[PDB]
Amino acid sequence: PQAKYRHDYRAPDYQITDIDLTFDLDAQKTVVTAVSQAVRHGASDAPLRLNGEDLKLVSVHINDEPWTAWKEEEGALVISNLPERFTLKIINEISPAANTALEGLYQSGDALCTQCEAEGFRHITYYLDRPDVLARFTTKIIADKIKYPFLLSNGNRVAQGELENGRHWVQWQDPFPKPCYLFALVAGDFDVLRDTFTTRSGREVALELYVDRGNLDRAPWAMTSLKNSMKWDEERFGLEYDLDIYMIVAVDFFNMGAMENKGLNIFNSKYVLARTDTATDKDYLDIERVIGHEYFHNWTGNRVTCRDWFQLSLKEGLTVFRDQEFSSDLGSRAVNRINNVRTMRGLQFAEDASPMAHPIRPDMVIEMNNFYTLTVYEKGAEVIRMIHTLLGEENFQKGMQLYFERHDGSAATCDDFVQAMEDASNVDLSHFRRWYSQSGTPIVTVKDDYNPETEQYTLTISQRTPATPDQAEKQPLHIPFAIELYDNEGKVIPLQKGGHPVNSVLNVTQAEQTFVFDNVYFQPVPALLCEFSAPVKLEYKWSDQQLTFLMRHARNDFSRWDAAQSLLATYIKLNVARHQQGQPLSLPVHVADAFRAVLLDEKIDPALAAEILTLPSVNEMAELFDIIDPIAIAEVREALTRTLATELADELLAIYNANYQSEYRVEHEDIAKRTLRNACLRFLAFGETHLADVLVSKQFHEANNMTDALAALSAAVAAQLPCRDALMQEYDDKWHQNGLVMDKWFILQATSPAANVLETVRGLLQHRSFTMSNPNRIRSLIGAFAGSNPAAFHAEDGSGYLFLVEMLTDLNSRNPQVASRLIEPLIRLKRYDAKRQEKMRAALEQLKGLENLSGDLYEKITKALA
């Protein structure tokens, strides 16, 4: 498999302006007829090079003339000696039932559906499968009426008819030119939830949610979220929907989360289906964010698309930023920001420290499906957020407006977007652009000095990004570094110098820089990198008392949580080192007291309290360490939970009881109290056994919603309580028929602290609710084990690696994209001790030698073994 390079971009020799597709649909043999209107832009002697994968070519015509000047080569059909303008007609066959990779046209249960991003359309017909080729699509679908009563594609129905032998057809037209990655087709039998949204300017939009028969009871929340998204994009960004119908189809077999196909989104059912007894608060909020995300792509992705796949973050960074803003505006901004920072620090930083490290705009790609990443998405959003920080909302929106004005109806680049922001705002972003081209996490080091003679406070700030495997050269970035200074009373000290106010967002642009503030009347306690103003590691020599002061006094809820994280970090590091020396947990009294104060503070938002009382995950803890000891980390996490459970037992029970809610509402105040109640339950599960066992089993049995039932079940597993096996069995017996609900149980099994966890996981490969054919099941059992139980995955006998090798040997052939998701924990080998590295290296070498090794895995394995 050959690497492709951003610097090699060249405008296409041919454009296609219009494509008329006909599908004669059948699960075993689908016949595709594609009539494209082409225009040569390149040299008159250039051939037309069409991409295609696993196609049975039937015929090639040019202006209805059977063509003789063509040849098929690996991944391509090369057509020679063409006119400047012509009609290309390709007929080919494909087999949806054989498509286990779930890219192109495939089968999901009894339905047929597509996934075309990034390069799936070439698995359907021979085409210019590159996103800078935009064409107007018409799509005719012919199928068995009984099997496929609904035949959907992008846009509007323009024709329909019936045929002999029980077949029928529907033709769709989408007036907006699009790259083929936004093509979609769905055929099947569905229940349909129908609603309307009327745009601000009065366009009535038909909303249609297609779900498997029997699932209508689980559709209203997704529909509500769609309308919420539509309204918010109008209010916040001034953007309205641009078509007459909006369709969403929920499918059970889907590699990603969801897909923004123009006017016909296709969603993993996980991000659509919810009812109070099947879905948790987190599920509801995830459905809201993913529904919003795909909706927001209508402008940031569809109306303006990507020139090439190296520009993926142009749509993903910006659309993730949009989904975060949507969630934050509608819900708790603090909780959203906290959660997104947990993801950055605990998951994205790990990626940026790995062999797969890449800039948010990659320079080199072998398999583009490998670049739908935490970096491109979440760090992408952090980069957009930094622009927002530097410009402010008003200028940021002017930049959005200029971006659309310039680029609506076209395929654009990351650089185009930055230019629009720069031009609209008059803020210089030339240095800022380096964020697009440099990988790795910057480390920002802060030293301070207070001079009582001059009443001046000085911050000496330095930055460096360690080299990464992809980049030997690193340079200083333009880092927006937000600060606040607090006096002894917790009042904010005005920032000023030389008689003029100074903006609280400092421009840290050099390797080392000095910032001086005057009229600092009292030695300040600083809050640094406020609201995580840049995606960086902060090094500052905090005292415990500075941190607890901030937990008490910081103006932004995020700063209070972040201070708690810095406080915990010190003692997590302390206790991991202790664990390695065979010593038990040590925690100063004043640290437990800080958390007691959070529990007993009447004024604190329950949403914030819940997050402060949620310990960093084992993945967040791992990133505190150069060399990861996953067993020490897991055992310290448990020990810390137990210590706090004991020290805070009375306060935890008081707050647990006080936050009881007899009514279940998916409303933000209710969610906050429930999140706090369940955060308390976590610790209580680790209290005196009988007490804990009664409390947990009672909650599981009395729960009137899945959030509370799952919190109890999770606690029983985490604390290995007596009731665990009974509750797990009850859940299986009640829910085995429901894959999405069973995913929660597979995750619990996979992440169990039980000594026999791997044995149980292996056994579950035969479970009635498990199947290797379904990405969700695979990720919930195998993915969760390898990625979310690093203590068990990294068992010293190497049994975890061997298990993953077995699974990947299957998935490499079945579904390379899911295989590539699942190999990620193995490619982190250099973060581990030498004994583990050698076993992980051995595992990787076994995979490297697989017959028919997918490009997806080849790319990761080669980087990991380098």
Q: Which is nearer to Zn ion, 326 or 803 (CB)?
A: 326
Instruction: Tell me how far apart the alpha carbons of residues 34 and 127 are, in angstroms, rounded to a whole number.
Output: 9
Q: Which is nearer to Zn ion, 67 or 271 (CB)?
A: 271
Q: Which is nearer to Zn ion, 309 or 517 (CB)?
A: 309
297 is in an annotated binding site: yes
Instruction: Tell me how far apart the alpha carbons of residues 278 and 175 are, in angstroms, rounded to a whole number.
Output: 39
Q: Which is nearer to Zn ion, 288 or 638 (CB)?
A: 288
Choose, from 294, 351, 422, 611, the residue flagged as catalytic. 294
Asked whether 156 and 139 are in contact (CB, 8 A), the reply is no
500 is in an annotated binding site: no
Q: What 3-state DSSP class applies to 103? A: coil
Which residue stretch of 35-43, 201-209, 279-287, 311-319 sits at the interface with Zn ion (rule: CB under 5 A)?
Answer: 311-319
549-565 burial, b for 16+ CB within 10 Å, e for fewer?
A: bbbbbbebbbbbbbbbb
165 is in an annotated binding site: no
Which residue stretch of 314-322, 635-643, 693-701, 769-777 sits at the interface with Zn ion (rule: CB under 5 A)?
Answer: 314-322
Instruction: Tell me how far apart the alpha carbons of residues 611 and 623 are, in angstroms, rounded to a whole number.
Output: 19
How many C-beta atoms lie closer than 10 Å to residue 835's C-beta? 10
| In the complex, minimum distance from the CB of residue 3 to Zn ion, in angstroms, rounded to a whole number | 24
| In the complex, minimum distance from the CB of residue 833 to Zn ion, in angstroms, rounded to a whole number | 37
478 is in an annotated binding site: no
What would the 3-class secondary structure string for 491-554 be?
Answer: CECCCEECCEECCCEEEECCCEEEEEECCCCCCCEEEECHHHCCCCEEECCCCHHHHHHHHHHC
Longest dimension (CA), the chain: 96
Residue 319 binding Zn ion, by CB under 5 A? yes
| In the complex, minimum distance from the CB of residue 371 to Zn ion, in angstroms, rounded to a whole number | 13
Instruction: Tell me how far apart the alpha carbons of residues 71 and 256 are, in angstroms, rounded to a whole number.
Output: 34
382 is in an annotated binding site: no
| In the complex, minimum distance from the CB of residue 241 to Zn ion, in angstroms, rounded to a whole number | 17
667 is in an annotated binding site: no
DSSP secondary structure, 586-612, as one string = ---HHHHHHHHHHHH-SSS-HHHHHHH
**Interhelix angle 834-848/855-865, nearest 10 degrees:** 150
Which residue stretch of 6-14, 162-170, 319-327, 422-430 sits at the interface with Zn ion (rule: CB under 5 A)?
Answer: 319-327
293 is in an annotated binding site: yes
* Size of interface with Zn ion, in residues (CB under 5 A): 2
Which residue stretch of 19-27, 310-318, 362-370, 532-540 sits at the interface with Zn ion (rule: CB under 5 A)?
Answer: 310-318
Q: Which is nearer to Zn ion, 380 or 630 (CB)?
A: 380
259 is in an annotated binding site: yes
Q: Which is nearer to Zn ion, 319 or 546 (CB)?
A: 319
> Which two tokens mark 688?
């005196």
| In the complex, minimum distance from the CB of residue 297 to Zn ion, in angstroms, rounded to a whole number | 6
| In the complex, minimum distance from the CB of residue 459 to Zn ion, in angstroms, rounded to a whole number | 37
| In the complex, minimum distance from the CB of residue 301 to Zn ion, in angstroms, rounded to a whole number | 7
Determine if the peptide bond prior to 118 is cis (ω within 30°).
yes
Q: How are beta strands 135-144 and 85-94 bridged, if at all? A: unpaired
Q: Which is nearer to Zn ion, 316 or 693 (CB)?
A: 316
Integer angstrom CA distances of residue 192 from 195, 438, 741, 791: 10, 46, 22, 44
Instruction: Tell me how far apart the alpha carbons of residues 832 and 794 are, in angstroms, rounded to a whole number.
Output: 9
Q: What 3-state DSSP class applies to 365? A: strand
Residue nearest to Zn ion according to CB distances in the complex = 319
Examine the residue annotation and report whether 623 is marked as an active-site residue of this protein: no
Binding-site entries: 117, 257-261, 293, 297, 316
Binding site for Zn ion (CB under 5 A): 316, 319
Binding-site entries for Zn(2+): 293, 297, 316
| Residues tagged active-site | 294
